[PDB]
Design a protein around this ligand. Structure first.
Ligand SMILES: [Mg+2]
Ligand code: NA
Length: 694
RNA sequence: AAAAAAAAA
């Protein structure tokens, strides 16, 4: 029996805060040990460790907490052990003395089977294991214990008194079975609070009266068309450009289309044409309000949760082929070296000639028998994109991009059959370079027009502390290093991290470097000074998101600001008010992050069940070593698995972790003879319910 | 918030 320390009185907290004795921060509990935590505070070169139950003082991941630094005698290094709630029962160091703002929402979990009596009718004290592996188990009291046994449940937490080792909560609702999929998708979206309800009648009431019969006007000065839409006479007719779009296979939500036309003077006319979402999505409407709140589209494996009604996303705003669409066009004159000669922005009417997938586009460009006007355009674009990318890389751009996973379904829409690691084609880079070009040109334009409230996106340099462990692993294990002299040194040394008799190693390190990045963040220009507009990863001075207004709210704002900048329409005073802008960025950074998390956890879920139906052996790479396990990346599946010590060894008493060598030594199960497993090792792995080292 | 860069979804 113990008692956590009582939180400091509210008056002690504000007195300590002011005297510089107490510090305030958001707690990040570690991704592998739930009884160990961190607070990042600009003072100290390193985040401050909070180690153990008492010191964490009933704090939940994400809590705004108040910490007190401990004496140097109590300073500790991070744990060499994996720990979640399910398996439970030197650096500057702090203790939690108070909880300022709590992150108790409704939480998804599953009953702990050993806390439940499956034959008892009466009310039981049972434990709930939360889906978030950062959190503690929660005691609930319920008469339905047996009926909730292998089910997906929502619980609410009520309290965690000083006197209790575990928080107390209650059952809220049932999602369904742990096998379901409907229940695991509802669970996933709750954990990341993505709104996925149908769009209200109020939202739908904003959509064009014509519905799917909406047509772009034939003549831009047609008196009828100009009466309903007076701004149409500022719209440029570009229905003469041989435009095309290049997207993933079978994609309905087409944001962008491109053209390239050789000019009379030797230069290039290049257009990037983007769905004109802000023509349909007006400020202060219920439709703008639902989209602003959603902030982003969320892509799950089996499911897309739209920011906007699909009448817009997949029909009227989509730059569909062979149909006249409105657009917002960025038009450059380019050198044959891809240097900007001039740039111009305009609302337009477009007619995409063809919608290609990446693969079809690639094969058409590489098809020596095809010599038509569209193919030559596409070929011109690929060429300009190569030069564009070359210049980005010379300027110090990072190329951290690795092959990602697409899961394929079987007999059912939620029953997964196989995992595809996506191969990059040159057309992927063709589109990316012009998206980048579009986004940079508009960011300069809107910051020009609105120096105080421009919708921008920055990316901080990583502290050296972000790369401290990875560089130590690379030195001790490989005699290699990642340089942080600059982003160019970072990119070049990363490129040179090569194992001759193992091409994957370089990709292993590239993916591991990506996790050492700072988060890129939307911001309004007035919040920072110009040198802090810096996008580190992209090595450009100013950046924004413009090219995807169907699926991201940042681009809706940027679009309005560009229409403001070119004198097409006045900018809504909403996007000229710093306080409203500041609240918008806060929200959309939150929606962006949540969507990345939800995305990844859907993939992890489906891939995990693909591998569960697979008996065979795979290649793995060790990306992490602990005293009681190893984390192994399996590239064929694109996912990590923990291999726990009870599976590596009988005699865990002799397992030995060498922290400076990143080496676990153990007597494997068959044997008498010890075995060394190091970070980075290529190993053989198989699933026999559990991942095992062959 | 020091809570994973970029592009298309
Ligand atoms: Mg596109
Ligand atoms: Na397309």
């Amino acid at each position: 029996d113990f008692t956590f320390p009582e939180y400091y009185s509210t008056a002690r907290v504000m007195g300590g805060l002011k005297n510089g004795v107490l510090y305030q921060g958001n707690i990040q509990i570690s991704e592998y040990n739930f009884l160990e935590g961190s607070v990042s505070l600009p003072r100290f070169s390193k985040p401050v460790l909070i180690v153990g139950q008492k010191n964490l003082n009933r704090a939940f991941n994400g809590d705004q907490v108040i910490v007190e630094l401990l004496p140097q005698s109590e300073w500790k290094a991070p744990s060499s052990i994996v720990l979640d709630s399910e398996h439970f029962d030197i650096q500057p160091t702090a203790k939690v003395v108070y909880i300022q703002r709590r992150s108790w929402r409704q939480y998804v979990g599953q009953l702990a089977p050993s806390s439940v009596d499956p034959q008892s009718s009466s009310t039981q004290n049972v434990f709930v294991i939360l889906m978030d592996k950062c959190l503690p188990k929660v005691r609930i009291r319920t008469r339905r214990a047996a009926e909730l046994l292998d089910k997906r449940i929502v619980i609410s937490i009520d309290s965690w008194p000083t006197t209790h080792k575990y928080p107390l909560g209650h059952f809220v609702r049932d999602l369904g079975t742990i096998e379901s999929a409907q229940a695991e998708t509802e669970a996933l979206l709750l954990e990341h609070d993505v709104e996925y309800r149908p769009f209200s009648k109020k939202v739908l009431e904003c959509l064009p009266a014509e519905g799917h019969d909406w047509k772009a006007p034939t003549k831009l000065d047609d008196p009828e068309a100009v009466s309903k839409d007076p701004l149409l006479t500022k719209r440029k007719d570009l229905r003469d450009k041989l435009i095309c779009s290049i997207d993933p296979p079978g994609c309905v939500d087409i944001n962008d289309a491109l053209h390239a036309k050789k000019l009379p003077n030797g230069n290039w006319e290049v257009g990037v044409h983007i769905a004109d979402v802000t023509h349909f999505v007006k400020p202060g409407t219920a439709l703008d309000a639902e989209g602003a709140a959603r902030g982003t589209s969320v892509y799950l494996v089996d499911k897309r949760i739209d920011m906007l009604p699909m009448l817009l996303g997949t029909d009227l705003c989509s730059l569909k082929p062979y149909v006249d669409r409105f657009a917002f066009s960025v038009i450059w004159e380019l050198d044959d070296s891809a240097n900007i000669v001039n740039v111009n922005f305009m609302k337009s009417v477009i007619r995409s000639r063809e919608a290609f997938s990446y693969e079809q586009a690639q094969l058409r460009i590489d098809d020596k028998t095809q010599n038509d006007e569209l193919t030559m355009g596409m070929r011109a674009l690929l060429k300009l994109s190569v030069k564009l990318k070359q210049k980005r890389l010379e300027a110090g751009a990072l190329n951290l991009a690795s092959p990602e996973v697409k899961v394929h379904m079987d007999s059912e829409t939620s029953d997964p059959n196989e995992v595809e690691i996506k191969k990059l084609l040159a057309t992927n880079s063709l589109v990316e370079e012009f998206m980048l070009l579009a986004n940079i040109s508009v960011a300069r334009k809107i910051y020009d027009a609105f120096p105080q409230t421009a919708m921008l996106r920055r990316h901080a340099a990583p502290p050296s502390t972000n790369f401290e462990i990875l560089n130590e692993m690379l030195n001790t294990r490989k005699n290699m290093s990642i340089s942080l002299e600059s982003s160019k040194a970072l990119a070049d040394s990363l490129d040179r991290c090569v194992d001759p008799e193992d091409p994957y190693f370089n990709t292993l390190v590239r993916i591991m470097s990506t996790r050492c990045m700072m988060a890129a963040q939307y911001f309004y220009s007035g919040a920072y000074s110009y040198p802090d507009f810096r996008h580190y990863g992209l090595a450009v001075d100013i950046y924004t998101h413009f090219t995807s207004p169907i699926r991201r709210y940042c681009d809706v704002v940027a679009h309005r600001q560009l229409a403001g900048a070119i004198g097409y329409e006045p900018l809504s005073l909403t996007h000229r008010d710093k306080n409203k802008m500041d609240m918008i960025c806060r929200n959309i950074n939150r929606k962006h992050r949540n969507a990345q998390f939800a995305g990844r956890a859907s993939i992890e879920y489906y891939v995990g069940q693909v591998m569960r139906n697979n008996e065979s052996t795979e290649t793995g790479y060790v990306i992490k070593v602990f005293n009681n396990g190893i984390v192994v990346l399996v590239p064929k599946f694109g996912v990590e698995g923990l291999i726990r010590l009870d599976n590596l060894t009988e005699d865990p008493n002799s397992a030995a972790f060498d922290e400076v060598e990143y080496k676990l030594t153990f007597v494997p199960t068959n044997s008498d003879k010890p075995r060394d497993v190091y970070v980075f090792d290529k190993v053989e792995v198989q699933v026999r319910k559990r991942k095992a080292e062959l």
